[PDB]
Amino acid sequence: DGLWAALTEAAASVEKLLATLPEHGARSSAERAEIAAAHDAARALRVRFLDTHADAVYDRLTDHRRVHLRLAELVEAAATAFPGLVPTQQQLAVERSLPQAAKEGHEIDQGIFLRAVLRSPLAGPHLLDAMLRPTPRALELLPEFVRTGEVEMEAVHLERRDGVARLTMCRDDRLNAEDGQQVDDMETAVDLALLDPGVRVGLLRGGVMSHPRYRGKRVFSAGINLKYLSQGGISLVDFLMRRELGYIHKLVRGVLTNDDRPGWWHSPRIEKPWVAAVDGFAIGGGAQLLLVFDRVLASSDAYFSLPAAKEGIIPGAANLRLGRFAGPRVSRQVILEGRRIWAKEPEARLLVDEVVEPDELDAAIERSLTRLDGDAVLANRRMLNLADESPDGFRAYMAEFALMQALRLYGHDVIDKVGRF
Amino acid sequence: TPRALELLPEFVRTGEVEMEAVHLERRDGVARLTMCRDDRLNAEDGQQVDDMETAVDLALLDPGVRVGLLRGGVMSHPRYRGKRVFSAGINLKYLSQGGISLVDFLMRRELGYIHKLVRGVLTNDDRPGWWHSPRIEKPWVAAVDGF
Ligand SMILES: CC(C)(COP(=O)(O)OP(=O)(O)OC[C@H]1O[C@@H](n2cnc3c(N)ncnc32)[C@H](O)[C@@H]1OP(=O)(O)O)[C@@H](O)C(=O)NCCC(=O)NCCNC(=O)Cc1cc(O)cc(O)c1
Ligand SMILES: CC(C)(COP(=O)(O)OP(=O)(O)OC[C@H]1O[C@@H](n2cnc3c(N)ncnc32)[C@H](O)[C@@H]1OP(=O)(O)O)[C@@H](O)C(=O)NCCC(=O)NCCNC(=O)Cc1cc(O)cc(O)c1
């Protein structure tokens, strides 16, 4: 064995190499190659080590799959129990304080870690269920929401009404560009909607924009905040992975609660149907969202796209779900070639259920909400999602994604492009 | 139009004519008419009709022009700044104001430049082939930005 011993050395070899070497972006060609080869040797051992001990490394962190740990708590606990395997909060604070172009790419190690974990028929499912449990922040807010029916947050406005959980993305100044805080609010909101007995159906829509170019008009989503990403503010674990295993997965499978109510023996997770209403446009992570709703409406002037065909990161789980909606040809036209799909063209019905003139939209959205109220919709929706996406499929995809994305999150072509927005 | 006759020699020489509602420019054999009321999304009015007809007349009378193109230009209004907009129709404000003329606007555009887009301009018997083509017509291309 002695793989740990080896890794600890490869890591040390790197850790000390960075202390003597000059600051990133001031290094010479011979220097960049040395630190590069060092990281490479370190990372290769991380894979080799986990390929045979991932389960043991995980059993120790979760007391043999007896304690559920969300993504952040897992990697943090991994950092302290296995120095060198993944970056400490400290190592990561230094990284988060540098613009993307100058990071050492320590997150990649977390990518290596989560891939091995997720690949296990034992740990992966356990980690997924962990992410399906309600956020502690939502539990805190649950009593006040059940009473007020209102919760204002930084990126989302939640309001209960007529049995509908109305989530409104309200970053009026940046066309709802996504960031870490938006993911926390989205998950918090989704958790509240699913935990409130007063809520029967959920609705996600964008609110009025204040920016001069869209003043007075609604805009669903302009995707990830490219400025922050360039700035080094987009977290692999806390943003990219958290949204896929968190609130987006809960939109599909609901929230795993404790055995604390009747029927839990047949429904451990509380799920509910969701409606998405797209105003203006849905780009990137926003268009990504759509592949998970029970109902989708859009105003006649909107379009859908995953633009970074060139130099972008992987469009989340779209590579996993789009084929199902559009077939492999259109799927590759949208993601590999960047084809944008307008609401009024025939193929938009592969993604949207209903397209309406902006002055008929609100009415159509209301009518949509009231058609998904019953228990028949709940049963049917659960069986359909079960057939459309299996536990293994989602898991295997999210496994390779963890790493593949980690790598794209530090690709020179991506960093460069993002720096020009 | 008499106004086009006046401007014909200067257009044949410069290949450019700036007007209040339209910008005409000859290039690569193309008569490029640009509706440029950047502040009101090219809302139509009496002056725009005079310019449109004047422009169409010039395009059809210039031997240097083979094909015509009509397009809207960049808007300055905050809601469309930097983007092109073809036409938002008649100026509703003026119409309310009593500034839309039945004869000079509504009828003039239909029997004037719009009919010339279809049948060309009837000239005098002052050139060969006039016996088989009294009107000079040319093909037109329209490019619509925004709406
Ligand atoms: C939407 C637009 C076409 C609008 O054009 P316009 O009408 O020309 O408005 P603009 O003047 O450009 O922008 C209005 C306003 O919003 C801001 N804006 C617009 N888009 C953005 C983004 N993406 N981030 C931040 N701010 C933005 C823009 O900076 C303006 O403010 P100012 O810069 O101060 O002027 C434009 O903003 C644009 O091209 N944005 C690029 C959209 C984009 O490419 N997003 C990339 C998406 N890529 C992903 O989501 C990747 C991803 C996301 C995920 O969530 C998960 C995942 O796994 C992968
Ligand atoms: C185009 C619009 C939808 C744009 O919406 P927005 O993005 O909301 O821009 P807005 O803020 O409304 O307008 C931008 C700007 O352009 C101005 N604008 C827009 N449309 C017009 C019109 N039609 N006239 C004058 N000014 C206009 C508008 O007043 C704004 O400036 P401010 O008032 O100071 O704010 C809106 O402007 C609009 O609804 N215009 C109504 C368009 C219309 O109905 N035209 C009526 C057409 N009816 C005919 O052409 C009839 C006709 C014409 C003929 O030529 C011949 C004939 O026989 C018959």
Alpha-carbon span A232 to A330, nearest angstrom: 33
Does the C-beta of A180 come closer than 6 Å to ligand 1?
Answer: no
Report the binding-site residues of B for substrate: 38, 44, 77-80, 88-93
Q: How many residues does chain B have?
A: 147
The residues near A211 (Cβ < 8 Å, ≥ 6 apart) are A172, A173, A174, A175
- Among candidate residues A257, A309, A306, the one with its CA nearest the CA of residue A282: A306
By the 8 A CB rule, do B16 and B26 touch? yes
Q: Which of the ligands is closest to the CA of residue A214?
A: 1
Superfamily of domain A134-421: 2-enoyl-CoA Hydratase; Chain A, domain 1 (3.90.226.10)
By the 8 A CB rule, do A230 and A412 touch? no
Beta strands in A15-87 (DSSP E): none
Atom 41, ligand 2: residue with shortest CA distance: B88
- Residue B127 CA, ligand 1 centroid: distance in Å: 59
- Among candidate residues A282, A284, A301, A288, the one with its CA nearest the CA of residue A343: A301
Report the binding-site residues of A for substrate: 172, 178, 211-214, 222-227, 285, 314-316, 405
Q: Helix, strand or coil for residue A326?
A: helix
DSSP A106: T
The residues near B41 (Cβ < 8 Å, ≥ 6 apart) are B75, B77, B80, B85, B87, B88, B146
Does the C-beta of A174 come closer than 6 Å to ligand 1?
Answer: yes
- Among candidate residues A33, A54, A104, the one with its CA nearest the CA of residue A409: A104
Alpha-carbon span A275 to A295, nearest angstrom: 5
Atom 2, ligand 1: residue with shortest CA distance: A222
Q: What is the position in ligand 2's atom list of the atom closest to the CA of B147?
A: 1
Residue intervals of chain A classified under CATH 1.20.58.1300 are 1-133
Buried b (16+ CB within 10 A) or exposed e, A371-393: ebeeeebbeebbeebeeebeeee
- Residue A178 CA, ligand 1 centroid: distance in Å: 10
Question: Residues A110, A396, A114, CA angle at the centre, nearest 5°?
Answer: 15
Sheet holding A281-283, edge to edge: A281-283, A303-305, A341-342
- Residue A417 CA, ligand 1 centroid: distance in Å: 13
A201: β partners:
A164
* Residue of B36, B37, B41, B42 with the most ligand 2 atoms within 8 Å of its CB, for mutation: B41
The residues near A95 (Cβ < 8 Å, ≥ 6 apart) are A87, A103, A104, A106, A107, A232
- Residue A335 CA, ligand 2 centroid: distance in Å: 38
Distance of CA A388 to the CA centre of its chain: 19
Alpha-carbon span B127 to B131, nearest angstrom: 9
- Residue A403 CA, ligand 2 centroid: distance in Å: 52
**Looking only at Cα atoms, what is the longest distance across chain B?**
53
Atom 30, ligand 2: residue with shortest CA distance: B40
Q: Which of the ligands is closest to the CA of residue B37?
A: 2
Does the C-beta of B100 come closer than 6 Å to ligand 2?
Answer: no
* Residue of A174, A220, A238, A239 with the most ligand 1 atoms within 8 Å of its CB, for mutation: A174
Does the C-beta of A226 come closer than 6 Å to ligand 1?
Answer: yes
For domain A1-133, give the CATH number: 1.20.58.1300
The residues near A47 (Cβ < 8 Å, ≥ 6 apart) are A112, A116
- Among candidate residues A282, A280, A259, the one with its CA nearest the CA of residue A269: A259
Q: Which of the ligands is closest to the CA of residue A212?
A: 1
Does the C-beta of A313 come closer than 6 Å to ligand 1?
Answer: yes
Does the C-beta of B83 come closer than 6 Å to ligand 2?
Answer: no
Atom 16, ligand 2: residue with shortest CA distance: B40
Q: CA separation (Å) from B55 to A134, B49, B69? A: 68, 10, 11
Residue intervals of chain A classified under CATH 3.90.226.10 are 134-421
* Residue of A224, A247, A306, A321 with the most ligand 1 atoms within 8 Å of its CB, for mutation: A224
Show the tokens assigned to B102: 């039945």
- Residue B21 CA, ligand 2 centroid: distance in Å: 16
By the 8 A CB rule, do A176 and A218 touch? no
B16: β partners:
B25
- Residue B51 CA, ligand 2 centroid: distance in Å: 20
Does the C-beta of B79 come closer than 6 Å to ligand 2?
Answer: yes
Atom 4, ligand 2: residue with shortest CA distance: B88
By the 8 A CB rule, do A306 and A351 touch? no
Determine how many CB atoms are found less than 10 A away from the CB of residue B74. 14
DSSP A221: B
Does the C-beta of A223 come closer than 6 Å to ligand 1?
Answer: yes
Q: Helix, strand or coil for residue A41?
A: helix
By the 8 A CB rule, do B24 and B11 touch? yes
Does the C-beta of B92 come closer than 6 Å to ligand 2?
Answer: yes
Q: Helix, strand or coil for residue B15?
A: coil
Q: What is the position in ligand 2's atom list of the atom closest to the CA of B91?
A: 24
- Residue A215 CA, ligand 2 centroid: distance in Å: 18
Q: What is the position in ligand 2's atom list of the atom closest to the CA of A216?
A: 8
